[PDB]
Amino acid sequence: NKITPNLAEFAFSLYRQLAHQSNSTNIFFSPVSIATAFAMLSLGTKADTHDEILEGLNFNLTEIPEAQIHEGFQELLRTLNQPDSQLQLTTGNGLFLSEGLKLVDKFLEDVKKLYHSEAFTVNFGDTEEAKKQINDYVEKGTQGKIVDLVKELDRDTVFALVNYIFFKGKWERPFEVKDTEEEDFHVDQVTTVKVPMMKRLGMFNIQHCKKLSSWVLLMKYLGNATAIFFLPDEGKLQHLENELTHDIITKFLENEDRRSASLHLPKLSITGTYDLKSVLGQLGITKVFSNGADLSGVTEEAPLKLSKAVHKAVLTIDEKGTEAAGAMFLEAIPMSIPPEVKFNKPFVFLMIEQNTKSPLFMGKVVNPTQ
């Protein structure tokens, strides 16, 4: 995909933002779902308001034609929306607009048609009821996994955006549940907590990488996606985070070589919840959230700004991701000592969609039971 490098840069800019704020919180978000929602929104915007959004998603508008940006997203979307999908991704974006705004039909068509997204009209005159309808939409869309997403609305809200994603992947080569046991997780150099720890002896795409001073593990999911886990050497987490680049990730993805390892990887259930006005504001996207907003592609008559924009991402990592029996296979394990590679201290990860190479998720686990 032509927009993948931009999405990768966007992932890292957003990640580094969130990490710079604190190294004591788990991080999990979807560069793809956030960028898709904001590229979609830009269709309703003009001039500086429009350009700030696309530049804040790491597109250099002097270099990449807008049609290519949207064709990029639309290609990515139809990949993630395949009827077959074993990925089982649950994602949506909801726009909630004041009833009695005269809405531009082209915008509503672009949202639904091009971006296969949803737009609703609500009575923002009733703040509590609007919040309920927004939260109900998300709860319904996730058949119950995300509850009470929006906690507050400004009394002057006339436009809110909610973007949700939940993923529980199925490993192509799964862990056996019988092997999951409680183990130490080193939350710092002197402190441990107990966490459920999966383990398997297998042939892995795994390597210890000098440039990143980290172990780098790639594991495939059923459907079209790969999880990449980066385990920094003692004291090297900040180094790892600084050194990550699109080129480097591309190299790992091209490596198919496999070697024996006794892998220990925690079960995880992690969420990330982000105020996108706040977070994207630090990346330069500010006008669309301000009284200045040029949202004339959405409504021509009345003033409009985006008052509320929230992202919530939910990840489960477990042994199989399904109760179904998987395809039986056999990996040939050499008679030699496998390295023991334990994801039992803070680590960073990315999930990549295989067709486009896009960064579906990025995160950091500082403590599995936080």
Short mmCIF file of C-alpha atoms in Angstrom, two decimals:
data_model
loop_
_atom_site.label_atom_id
_atom_site.label_comp_id
_atom_site.label_asym_id
_atom_site.label_seq_id
_atom_site.Cartn_x
_atom_site.Cartn_y
_atom_site.Cartn_z
CA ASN A 1 0.00 0.00 0.00
CA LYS A 2 1.12 3.55 -0.93
CA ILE A 3 -0.05 5.08 2.40
CA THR A 4 1.58 2.46 4.68
CA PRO A 5 4.80 4.47 5.36
CA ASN A 6 2.72 7.46 6.38
CA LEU A 7 0.57 5.29 8.66
CA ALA A 8 3.79 3.84 10.14
CA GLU A 9 5.12 7.37 10.85
CA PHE A 10 1.74 8.31 12.32
CA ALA A 11 1.90 5.20 14.58
CA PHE A 12 5.31 6.17 15.93
CA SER A 13 4.48 9.87 16.39
CA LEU A 14 1.35 8.98 18.33
CA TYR A 15 3.14 6.25 20.28
CA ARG A 16 6.07 8.48 21.22
CA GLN A 17 3.57 11.15 22.32
CA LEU A 18 1.78 8.80 24.65
CA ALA A 19 5.04 7.23 25.94
CA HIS A 20 6.61 10.66 26.61
CA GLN A 21 3.68 11.41 28.94
CA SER A 22 4.50 8.45 31.30
CA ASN A 23 6.52 5.20 31.41
CA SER A 24 4.14 3.53 33.92
CA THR A 25 0.94 2.95 31.93
CA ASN A 26 0.10 0.23 29.38
CA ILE A 27 -0.38 1.72 25.88
CA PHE A 28 -2.66 0.23 23.20
CA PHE A 29 -4.23 1.99 20.22
CA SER A 30 -4.95 1.52 16.51
CA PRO A 31 -2.97 3.82 14.20
CA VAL A 32 -5.15 2.54 11.35
CA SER A 33 -8.56 3.09 12.93
CA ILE A 34 -7.70 6.61 14.18
CA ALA A 35 -6.15 7.67 10.84
CA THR A 36 -9.04 6.20 8.83
CA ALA A 37 -11.57 8.10 10.97
CA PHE A 38 -9.68 11.40 10.57
CA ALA A 39 -9.02 10.94 6.84
CA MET A 40 -12.77 10.34 6.54
CA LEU A 41 -13.56 13.46 8.59
CA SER A 42 -11.27 15.55 6.39
CA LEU A 43 -13.71 14.94 3.50
CA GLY A 44 -16.09 17.30 5.37
CA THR A 45 -13.45 19.99 5.87
CA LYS A 46 -11.67 22.66 3.79
CA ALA A 47 -8.50 24.74 3.68
CA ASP A 48 -6.31 24.99 6.82
CA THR A 49 -8.75 22.81 8.81
CA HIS A 50 -8.47 20.10 6.17
CA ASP A 51 -4.71 20.33 5.64
CA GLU A 52 -3.89 20.28 9.42
CA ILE A 53 -5.74 16.94 9.69
CA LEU A 54 -3.93 15.24 6.81
CA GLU A 55 -0.52 16.72 7.76
CA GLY A 56 -1.15 15.56 11.36
CA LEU A 57 -1.61 12.01 9.98
CA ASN A 58 1.89 12.37 8.46
CA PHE A 59 0.89 13.06 4.86
CA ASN A 60 3.00 15.68 3.11
CA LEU A 61 0.39 17.38 0.96
CA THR A 62 3.05 18.91 -1.33
CA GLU A 63 4.05 15.34 -2.26
CA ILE A 64 1.07 13.00 -2.14
CA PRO A 65 -2.16 13.71 -4.10
CA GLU A 66 -5.30 13.59 -1.96
CA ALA A 67 -6.97 11.03 -4.23
CA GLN A 68 -4.10 8.64 -3.42
CA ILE A 69 -4.57 9.14 0.32
CA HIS A 70 -8.28 8.20 0.09
CA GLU A 71 -7.71 5.37 -2.36
CA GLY A 72 -5.09 4.17 0.15
CA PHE A 73 -7.61 4.10 3.01
CA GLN A 74 -10.33 2.52 0.88
CA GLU A 75 -8.00 -0.30 -0.17
CA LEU A 76 -7.07 -0.89 3.48
CA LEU A 77 -10.74 -0.87 4.45
CA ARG A 78 -11.92 -3.48 1.98
CA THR A 79 -9.04 -5.71 3.15
CA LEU A 80 -10.24 -5.48 6.76
CA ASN A 81 -13.88 -5.83 5.73
CA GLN A 82 -13.54 -9.04 3.67
CA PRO A 83 -16.56 -11.38 4.14
CA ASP A 84 -14.13 -14.30 4.75
CA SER A 85 -12.06 -12.58 7.47
CA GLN A 86 -10.66 -14.93 10.11
CA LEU A 87 -9.22 -11.84 11.78
CA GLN A 88 -12.62 -11.20 13.34
CA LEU A 89 -11.74 -7.54 13.91
CA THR A 90 -14.54 -5.48 15.50
CA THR A 91 -14.23 -1.80 14.59
CA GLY A 92 -16.48 1.15 13.90
CA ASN A 93 -16.55 4.87 13.76
CA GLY A 94 -19.70 6.77 14.71
CA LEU A 95 -20.37 10.41 13.90
CA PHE A 96 -23.09 12.04 16.01
CA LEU A 97 -24.36 15.37 14.67
CA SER A 98 -26.88 17.79 16.13
CA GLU A 99 -30.35 17.14 14.72
CA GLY A 100 -31.57 20.18 12.79
CA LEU A 101 -28.17 20.87 11.26
CA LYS A 102 -28.74 20.81 7.54
CA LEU A 103 -26.21 18.16 6.54
CA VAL A 104 -24.46 18.00 3.18
CA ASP A 105 -25.53 14.79 1.40
CA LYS A 106 -22.19 14.18 -0.30
CA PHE A 107 -20.50 14.03 3.07
CA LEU A 108 -23.02 11.47 4.35
CA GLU A 109 -22.60 9.42 1.16
CA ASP A 110 -18.76 9.53 1.41
CA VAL A 111 -18.86 8.42 5.09
CA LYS A 112 -21.17 5.46 4.48
CA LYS A 113 -20.21 4.56 0.89
CA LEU A 114 -16.44 5.22 0.64
CA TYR A 115 -15.50 4.67 4.28
CA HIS A 116 -18.28 2.24 5.24
CA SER A 117 -18.83 4.22 8.43
CA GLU A 118 -21.91 5.50 10.32
CA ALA A 119 -23.47 8.91 10.91
CA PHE A 120 -26.28 9.68 13.29
CA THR A 121 -28.31 12.68 14.26
CA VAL A 122 -29.02 13.22 17.94
CA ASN A 123 -30.56 15.75 20.27
CA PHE A 124 -27.59 17.36 21.93
CA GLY A 125 -30.11 19.58 23.78
CA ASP A 126 -30.33 16.55 26.05
CA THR A 127 -26.70 15.96 27.10
CA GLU A 128 -27.35 12.87 29.19
CA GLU A 129 -29.48 11.23 26.57
CA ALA A 130 -27.01 11.99 23.77
CA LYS A 131 -24.24 10.36 25.87
CA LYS A 132 -26.47 7.31 26.35
CA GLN A 133 -27.16 6.93 22.63
CA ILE A 134 -23.43 7.26 21.79
CA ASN A 135 -22.47 4.67 24.47
CA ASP A 136 -25.34 2.38 23.42
CA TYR A 137 -24.12 2.47 19.80
CA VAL A 138 -20.61 1.42 20.90
CA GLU A 139 -21.89 -1.24 23.31
CA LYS A 140 -24.08 -2.67 20.55
CA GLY A 141 -21.24 -2.51 17.96
CA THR A 142 -18.94 -4.50 20.26
CA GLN A 143 -21.71 -6.85 21.42
CA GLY A 144 -20.87 -5.69 24.99
CA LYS A 145 -17.03 -5.39 25.15
CA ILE A 146 -16.84 -1.59 25.44
CA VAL A 147 -19.18 0.03 27.96
CA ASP A 148 -19.63 3.69 29.04
CA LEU A 149 -17.05 4.92 26.54
CA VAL A 150 -18.02 8.62 26.72
CA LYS A 151 -18.05 9.88 30.32
CA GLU A 152 -18.83 13.55 29.69
CA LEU A 153 -20.13 15.94 26.99
CA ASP A 154 -19.65 19.71 26.85
CA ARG A 155 -23.07 21.36 27.10
CA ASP A 156 -22.27 23.11 23.80
CA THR A 157 -21.57 19.81 21.91
CA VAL A 158 -22.99 19.69 18.43
CA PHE A 159 -20.66 17.07 16.96
CA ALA A 160 -18.98 13.99 18.49
CA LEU A 161 -16.87 11.23 16.98
CA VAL A 162 -16.29 7.80 18.61
CA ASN A 163 -13.86 5.25 17.24
CA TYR A 164 -13.72 1.76 18.71
CA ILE A 165 -11.74 -1.37 17.98
CA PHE A 166 -11.54 -4.77 19.66
CA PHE A 167 -9.30 -7.62 18.59
CA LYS A 168 -8.76 -11.15 19.85
CA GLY A 169 -6.59 -12.96 17.32
CA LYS A 170 -6.18 -16.67 16.70
CA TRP A 171 -2.51 -17.73 16.49
CA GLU A 172 -1.71 -19.77 13.41
CA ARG A 173 0.50 -21.83 15.72
CA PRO A 174 -1.23 -21.68 19.10
CA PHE A 175 -0.13 -22.23 22.70
CA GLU A 176 -1.59 -25.19 24.61
CA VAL A 177 -3.79 -24.01 27.51
CA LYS A 178 -2.36 -26.77 29.70
CA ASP A 179 1.03 -25.07 29.60
CA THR A 180 -0.12 -21.67 30.93
CA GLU A 181 1.12 -21.16 34.48
CA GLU A 182 1.66 -18.22 36.83
CA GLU A 183 5.13 -16.62 36.45
CA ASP A 184 6.97 -13.53 37.59
CA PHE A 185 6.69 -10.32 35.53
CA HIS A 186 9.43 -7.81 36.31
CA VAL A 187 7.62 -4.48 36.53
CA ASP A 188 11.02 -2.96 37.37
CA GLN A 189 14.56 -4.22 38.09
CA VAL A 190 13.74 -5.10 41.71
CA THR A 191 9.99 -5.89 41.68
CA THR A 192 7.83 -8.72 40.38
CA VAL A 193 4.17 -9.45 40.13
CA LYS A 194 2.52 -12.83 39.22
CA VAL A 195 0.87 -13.08 35.78
CA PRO A 196 -0.55 -16.00 33.76
CA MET A 197 2.25 -16.87 31.33
CA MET A 198 1.75 -18.98 28.21
CA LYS A 199 4.68 -21.00 26.99
CA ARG A 200 5.61 -23.14 24.00
CA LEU A 201 8.71 -24.76 22.50
CA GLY A 202 8.49 -24.18 18.76
CA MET A 203 10.26 -22.89 15.68
CA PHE A 204 9.82 -19.11 15.68
CA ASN A 205 10.64 -16.16 13.61
CA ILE A 206 12.74 -14.77 16.47
CA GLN A 207 16.06 -12.98 16.65
CA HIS A 208 18.10 -10.84 18.92
CA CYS A 209 18.64 -7.54 17.11
CA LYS A 210 21.73 -5.41 17.79
CA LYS A 211 20.31 -2.13 16.41
CA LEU A 212 17.32 -2.30 18.72
CA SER A 213 19.17 -4.06 21.58
CA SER A 214 16.06 -6.26 21.85
CA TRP A 215 14.66 -9.69 21.05
CA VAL A 216 12.23 -9.44 18.15
CA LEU A 217 9.50 -12.04 17.77
CA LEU A 218 7.02 -12.33 14.87
CA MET A 219 3.91 -14.50 15.21
CA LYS A 220 1.19 -14.98 12.65
CA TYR A 221 -2.54 -14.81 13.26
CA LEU A 222 -5.22 -16.57 11.23
CA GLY A 223 -6.65 -13.92 8.89
CA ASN A 224 -4.21 -11.57 7.44
CA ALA A 225 -2.06 -10.25 10.28
CA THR A 226 1.23 -10.59 12.20
CA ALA A 227 2.10 -9.56 15.76
CA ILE A 228 5.64 -8.24 16.24
CA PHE A 229 6.94 -8.18 19.83
CA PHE A 230 10.03 -6.31 20.91
CA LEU A 231 11.69 -7.24 24.18
CA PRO A 232 14.39 -4.73 25.16
CA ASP A 233 17.67 -5.78 26.82
CA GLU A 234 18.12 -4.60 30.44
CA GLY A 235 17.91 -0.77 30.52
CA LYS A 236 17.20 -0.46 26.77
CA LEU A 237 13.45 0.23 26.56
CA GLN A 238 13.93 3.94 25.74
CA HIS A 239 16.56 3.00 23.13
CA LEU A 240 14.16 0.52 21.49
CA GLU A 241 11.36 3.10 21.34
CA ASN A 242 13.73 5.71 19.81
CA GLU A 243 15.19 3.37 17.20
CA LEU A 244 11.99 1.89 15.71
CA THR A 245 11.45 2.83 12.06
CA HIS A 246 9.30 1.64 9.19
CA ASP A 247 12.37 0.34 7.28
CA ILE A 248 13.47 -1.79 10.22
CA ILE A 249 9.99 -3.28 10.72
CA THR A 250 9.82 -4.04 6.98
CA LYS A 251 13.09 -6.04 7.23
CA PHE A 252 11.71 -8.25 10.02
CA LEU A 253 8.54 -8.90 8.08
CA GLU A 254 10.61 -10.06 5.08
CA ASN A 255 12.52 -12.57 7.28
CA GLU A 256 10.94 -16.01 7.09
CA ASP A 257 13.85 -17.97 8.81
CA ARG A 258 12.79 -19.92 11.90
CA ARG A 259 14.78 -21.10 14.95
CA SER A 260 13.99 -23.11 18.08
CA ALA A 261 12.96 -21.13 21.18
CA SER A 262 11.19 -21.80 24.48
CA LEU A 263 8.90 -18.76 24.38
CA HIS A 264 7.08 -17.43 27.40
CA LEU A 265 4.41 -14.82 26.58
CA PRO A 266 1.81 -13.42 28.92
CA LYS A 267 -1.88 -13.75 28.43
CA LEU A 268 -3.11 -10.16 28.08
CA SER A 269 -6.29 -8.22 28.32
CA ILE A 270 -5.48 -4.57 27.76
CA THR A 271 -7.35 -1.45 26.79
CA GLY A 272 -6.29 2.03 25.79
CA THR A 273 -8.72 4.97 26.01
CA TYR A 274 -7.76 8.25 24.43
CA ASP A 275 -9.17 11.76 24.15
CA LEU A 276 -8.30 12.46 20.53
CA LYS A 277 -8.86 16.24 20.84
CA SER A 278 -6.06 16.19 23.39
CA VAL A 279 -3.76 13.63 21.79
CA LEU A 280 -4.12 14.78 18.17
CA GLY A 281 -3.83 18.39 19.35
CA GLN A 282 -0.21 17.65 20.30
CA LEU A 283 0.31 16.35 16.78
CA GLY A 284 -0.96 19.65 15.34
CA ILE A 285 -4.62 18.82 14.60
CA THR A 286 -6.39 21.72 16.36
CA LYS A 287 -8.62 23.78 14.03
CA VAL A 288 -11.29 21.09 13.51
CA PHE A 289 -11.87 21.05 17.27
CA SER A 290 -11.96 24.88 17.57
CA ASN A 291 -14.60 27.55 16.89
CA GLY A 292 -12.59 28.35 13.75
CA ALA A 293 -13.34 24.94 12.17
CA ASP A 294 -14.08 24.83 8.48
CA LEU A 295 -16.52 21.95 8.44
CA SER A 296 -18.48 23.37 5.49
CA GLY A 297 -18.38 19.96 3.70
CA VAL A 298 -20.58 18.66 6.54
CA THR A 299 -22.95 21.60 6.96
CA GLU A 300 -22.98 24.85 4.89
CA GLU A 301 -25.32 27.10 6.87
CA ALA A 302 -24.33 26.77 10.50
CA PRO A 303 -21.04 26.96 12.43
CA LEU A 304 -19.69 23.56 13.49
CA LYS A 305 -16.74 22.15 15.38
CA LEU A 306 -15.84 18.65 16.56
CA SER A 307 -16.47 18.93 20.34
CA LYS A 308 -15.67 15.32 21.34
CA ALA A 309 -13.46 12.64 19.80
CA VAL A 310 -12.64 9.38 21.63
CA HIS A 311 -10.70 6.24 20.69
CA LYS A 312 -10.89 3.01 22.65
CA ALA A 313 -8.89 -0.05 21.66
CA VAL A 314 -9.23 -3.44 23.38
CA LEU A 315 -6.87 -6.37 22.94
CA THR A 316 -6.98 -9.93 24.17
CA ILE A 317 -3.96 -12.19 23.84
CA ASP A 318 -4.51 -15.83 24.82
CA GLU A 319 -3.52 -19.35 23.80
CA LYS A 320 -5.78 -19.94 20.77
CA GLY A 321 -8.31 -17.07 20.47
CA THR A 322 -11.01 -19.65 19.80
CA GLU A 323 -12.63 -22.78 21.24
CA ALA A 324 -12.43 -24.36 17.71
CA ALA A 325 -9.97 -27.14 16.92
CA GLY A 326 -7.17 -25.77 14.74
CA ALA A 327 -5.40 -27.44 11.81
CA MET A 328 -2.87 -29.96 13.10
CA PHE A 329 0.74 -29.33 12.19
CA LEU A 330 4.18 -30.43 13.30
CA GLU A 331 7.29 -28.29 13.67
CA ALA A 332 10.67 -30.03 13.52
CA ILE A 333 12.57 -29.14 16.71
CA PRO A 334 16.39 -29.61 16.65
CA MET A 335 18.34 -31.50 19.31
CA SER A 336 20.00 -28.37 20.68
CA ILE A 337 19.39 -25.99 23.56
CA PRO A 338 16.74 -23.47 22.59
CA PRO A 339 17.11 -19.92 23.92
CA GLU A 340 14.61 -19.16 26.60
CA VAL A 341 12.88 -15.92 25.60
CA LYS A 342 10.50 -14.61 28.29
CA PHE A 343 8.22 -11.61 27.74
CA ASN A 344 8.32 -11.02 31.48
CA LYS A 345 9.37 -7.33 31.68
CA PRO A 346 8.08 -4.29 29.83
CA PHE A 347 7.83 -4.78 26.03
CA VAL A 348 6.51 -3.00 22.92
CA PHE A 349 4.44 -4.54 20.08
CA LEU A 350 2.83 -3.85 16.75
CA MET A 351 0.24 -5.79 14.80
CA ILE A 352 0.57 -5.53 11.06
CA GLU A 353 -2.05 -6.31 8.38
CA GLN A 354 -0.32 -8.63 5.91
CA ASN A 355 -1.70 -7.40 2.56
CA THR A 356 -1.06 -3.69 3.12
CA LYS A 357 1.62 -3.94 5.80
CA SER A 358 -0.35 -1.30 7.71
CA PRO A 359 0.04 -0.91 11.45
CA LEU A 360 -3.30 -2.12 12.82
CA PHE A 361 -2.15 -1.74 16.43
CA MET A 362 0.75 -0.52 18.47
CA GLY A 363 1.26 -0.74 22.24
CA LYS A 364 3.44 -1.27 25.28
CA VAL A 365 2.89 -3.62 28.18
CA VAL A 366 4.35 -2.26 31.37
CA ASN A 367 2.27 -4.58 33.61
CA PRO A 368 -0.17 -7.25 32.30
CA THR A 369 -2.33 -6.99 35.41
CA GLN A 370 -2.49 -3.15 35.60
#
